[PDB]
């Protein structure tokens, strides 16, 4: 009776273990699913009053579901809210109402093979040279998901790109920073790495992951969820600050994996009890984190154990160098516009200037 959607890159088996712990106490079975594009499927099935009871995604998507009336306002009392970091409640704050439970805070870091690269580059600019050392050996410096703007954004933003100008605890949807000087420098650098054969326009999550995990590439760009598979692989890896660009620190967009309750769910009390009293506990999170690391968890008591982990220290350091995603409805437009921008600039279909121009138009209008 309890159906959960969570993306395929997350700890869905650990989450089902927490769902067994629930069935044990309530008699209610939990069905964890990981459909493709589920963030895209949700507004379509919830808009007809359909979908899962609970949906897990980064908080960025949630402003849009909320103002469309697809998410239940959640009702944690103040004692429960005191359990979690204040900024993680900020992330799910839409129009002044809490619209999801925050689970974990995610930032991309640089992941490097210590065997091939004992001292990883401090800069983007030294990557070309390193690539030339590695190639001679049949290996490459760096492979990461080029298809999703999330992975390329840290670089576009370094020298001054931004999504929506942040004013007073607010956001201006007419002021988009996707087509400024810093955005152009950033995307030009990425396009120049592809042009000079240091990376390939067609590299995706799976391709990049298999290459790093097999030891074919010295580095990758990835988040906490990815470290379990690296642990299984026998690559000896470090988790560090992203390269700087033009002497500036890469600025990843920071996501707070969050759990929304479908407004059409006839099981809202069950969903509440599951999220508060099973998932968001030291035991629940550890069942999930054990499956695929979550990053810096929202739950203070569990985060203090995780915080000592140097991979977590470097995750939080990249997070502090980047920006919390907006949750406003306009984010999916912003993301679709930067997706096409980067794809088209990588492939040659548009120059950097004309790609970022059209993204600016599509992000803001
Ligand atoms: O590019 C098209 C794509 O854009 C939007 O997706 C963005 C996500 O909503 C945003 O959270 C972020 O997603 C990353 C996850 O948060 C992270 O946990 C991990 O799973 O990697 C994701 C990157 O794949 O970034 C993407 C931007 O790439 C929009 O919501 C999507 O529906 C749309 O298909």
Curated annotation (Swiss-Prot):
Keyword NADP: no
Domain of life: Bacteria
UniProt-listed GO biological process terms: carbohydrate transport; cell chemotaxis; detection of maltose stimulus; DNA damage response; maltodextrin transmembrane transport; maltose transport
PROSITE patterns: SBP_BACTERIAL_1
Compartment(s) where it occurs, according to its Swiss-Prot or TrEMBL record: Periplasm
GO molecular function: carbohydrate transmembrane transporter activity; maltose binding
Induction: Induced by maltose and the transcriptional regulator MalT. Permanently repressed by cold shock in a PNPase-dependent fashion.
GO cellular component terms, semicolon-separated: ATP-binding cassette (ABC) transporter complex; ATP-binding cassette (ABC) transporter complex, substrate-binding subunit-containing; maltose transport complex; membrane; outer membrane-bounded periplasmic space; periplasmic space
Listed Gene3D superfamilies: Periplasmic binding protein-like II
One Pfam family named in its UniProt record: SBP_bac_1
SUPFAM superfamilies found in the cross-reference section: Periplasmic binding protein-like II (SSF53850)
UniProtKB keywords: Periplasm, Signal, Sugar transport, Transport
Cytoplasm in keyword set: no
Similarity section: Belongs to the bacterial solute-binding protein 1 family.
Function description: Part of the ABC transporter complex MalEFGK involved in maltose/maltodextrin import. Binds maltose and higher maltodextrins such as maltotriose.
Subunit structure: The complex is composed of two ATP-binding proteins (MalK), two transmembrane proteins (MalG and MalF) and a solute-binding protein (MalE).
Protein name: Maltose/maltodextrin-binding periplasmic protein
Source organism (scientific name): Escherichia coli (strain K12)
